[PDB]
Amino acid sequence: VMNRLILAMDLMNRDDALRVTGEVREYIDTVKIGYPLVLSEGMDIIAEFRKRFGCRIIADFAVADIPETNEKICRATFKAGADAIIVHGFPGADSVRACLNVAEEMGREVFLLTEMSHPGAEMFIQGAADEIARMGVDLGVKNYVGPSTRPERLSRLREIIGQDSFLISPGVGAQGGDPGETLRFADAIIVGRSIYLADNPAAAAAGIIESIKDL
Amino acid sequence: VMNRLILAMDLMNRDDALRVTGEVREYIDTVKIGYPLVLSEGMDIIAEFRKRFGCRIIADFAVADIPETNEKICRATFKAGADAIIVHGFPGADSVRACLNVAEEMGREVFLLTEMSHPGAEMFIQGAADEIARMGVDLGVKNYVGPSTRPERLSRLREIIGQDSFLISPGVGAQGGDPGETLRFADAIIVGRSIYLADNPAAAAAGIIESIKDL
Numbered sequence: 192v193m194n195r196l197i198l199a200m201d202l203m204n205r206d207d208a209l210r211v212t213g214e215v216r217e218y219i220d221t222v223k224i225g226y227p228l229v230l231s232e233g234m235d236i237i238a239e240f241r242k243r244f245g246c247r248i249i250a251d252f253a254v255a256d257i258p259e260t261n262e263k264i265c266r267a268t269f270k271a272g273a274d275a276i277i278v279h280g281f282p283g284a285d286s287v288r289a290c291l292n293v294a295e296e297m298g299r300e301v302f303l304l305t306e307m308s309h310p311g312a313e314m315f316i317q318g319a320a321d322e323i324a325r326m327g328v329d330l331g332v333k334n335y336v337g338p339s340t341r342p343e344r345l346s347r348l349r350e351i352i353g354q355d356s357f358l359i360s361p362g363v364g365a366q367g368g369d370p371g372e373t374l375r376f377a378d379a380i381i382v383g384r385s386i387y388l389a390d391n392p393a394a395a396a397a398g399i400i401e402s403i404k405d406l
Numbered sequence: 407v408m409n410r411l412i413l414a415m416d417l418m419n420r421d422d423a424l425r426v427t428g429e430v431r432e433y434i435d436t437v438k439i440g441y442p443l444v445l446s447e448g449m450d451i452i453a454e455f456r457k458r459f460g461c462r463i464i465a466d467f468a469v470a471d472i473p474e475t476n477e478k479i480c481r482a483t484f485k486a487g488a489d490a491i492i493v494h495g496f497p498g499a500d501s502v503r504a505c506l507n508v509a510e511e512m513g514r515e516v517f518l519l520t521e522m523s524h525p526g527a528e529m530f531i532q533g534a535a536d537e538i539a540r541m542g543v544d545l546g547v548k549n550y551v552g553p554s555t556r557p558e559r560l561s562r563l564r565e566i567i568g569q570d571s572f573l574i575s576p577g578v579g580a581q582g583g584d585p586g587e588t589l590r591f592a593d594a595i596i597v598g599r600s601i602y603l604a605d606n607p608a609a610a611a612a613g614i615i616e617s618i619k620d621l
């Protein structure tokens with residue numbers, strides 16, 4: 192992705208979301224749009240972003256249901272123009288395969304969320320995360336998400352998925368993660384608040400990119 | 407809930423969703439609306455259903471993100487008029503507390519999803535489910551979701567949450583669960599396809615209710 196930086200656009204107002212995305216577009220080629228924006232402004236926001244900004248869109252819907260429902264969610268998500276969807280691994284292999292099937296049908300991609308970045312992830316997810324990743328490999332998943340806040344866990348993930356798989360990582364900035372350290376293991380970092388709540392989002396993005404180019 | 411039966415309205419077309427819900431409204435007082443319908447027709451469908459049918463609405467959004475994102479999701483969901491939201495316990499206590507905080511702010515309810523009903527739940531969720539339920543109790547959660555497909559697990563859940571907590575249960579019909587057995591432990595059953603794919607949804611709902619009244 193351009194500059195190895197993905198914007199997490201979690202503002203919940205279309206006008207503000209368009210403004211910030213437009214201001215930082217020169218520094219990214221990929222925007223992650225989640226439920227905060229979609230449930231506030233509608234699924235049509237995905238196609239609007241893709242057209243206006245010409246950026247790839249990852250639908251961060253943390254998909255976590257039974258297989259039949261996951262199918263429906265993916266179909267709706269790709270019909271709305273998303274390039275990829277983020278799917279939880281914790282519900283198990285059938286739930287993940289359902290998403291992979293729809294992606295194969297519609298020519299898109301699944302990202303498997305393996306271990307989450309917040310403190311509560313330590314309770315249940317972390318203990319399963321290596322296995323979730325190994326399940327991903329066994330299902331042929333090639334794209335993964337793991338936590339900037341725990342680079343030792345992000346290293347272990349990379350170890351499981353191999354060098355060829357694509358790994359993106361949230362928790363940089365607001366949650367405490369560091370861009371450079373995270374990029375030792377991830378291919379790209381996801382950044383939301385450190386950019387979209389900044390007084391000058393373009394300056395914040397540029398500052399991050401400048402510390403990235405130094406790698 | 408009326409007749410202890412909650413309709414899972416996972417049709418993805420507003421016209422079909424309105425037709426089936428209207429046909430079965432005499433037999434229910436509560437409709438669960440999930441992402442299949444919302445991502446297809448928009449969040450405004452929640453208020454439309456609540457007004458047209460006068461039914462309570464549970465937003466089944468299987469909320470499974472970090473605390474700050476979960477907050478945003480709940481706020482948007484209640485702003486759209488939902489009476490309650492379904493939240494995953496697997497992301498841990500902070501993610502769940504974030505949802506409880508918004509519910510307390512806005513005068514609504516959280517249902518905690520503890521163990522899922524599909525085969526893949528056996529891989530990771532089942533091994534954590536007792537703890538997830540105990541975490542719920544410790545956070546003051548009063549409403550829970552557990553699996554019709556495993557009544558022995560549904561019994562163990564009930565055992566943890568106590569007699570006073572409210573427990574609803576999907577996986578009845580299509581997934582193999584039985585109404586009467588599930589209602590030995592759950593307060594209400596969730597039913598989707600067995601009703602909404604039936605040639606006569608009113609007849610299917612009535613058939614279920616008739617086997618329920620016999621308890």
Ligand SMILES: COC(=O)c1cc(=O)[nH]c(=O)n1[C@@H]1O[C@H](COP(=O)(O)O)[C@@H](O)[C@H]1O
Binds near residue numbers: 277307362363470471
């Ligand atoms: C489930 O979706 C994610 O991509 C996600 C997983 C995770 O473990 N941590 C995490 O922060 N995210 C998302 O990534 C974004 C992080 O944004 P932030 O930089 O903290 O403001 C935000 O959209 C989160 O919901």
Ligand SMILES: COC(=O)c1cc(=O)[nH]c(=O)n1[C@@H]1O[C@H](COP(=O)(O)O)[C@@H](O)[C@H]1O
Binds near residue numbers: 524580
């Ligand atoms: C996460 O949301 C749920 O309520 C859910 C959890 C679960 O473990 N099993 C489960 O079936 N559900 C939902 O309940 C509905 C079941 O519908 P069905 O009767 O199988 O057609 C459908 O909306 C599922 O997504």
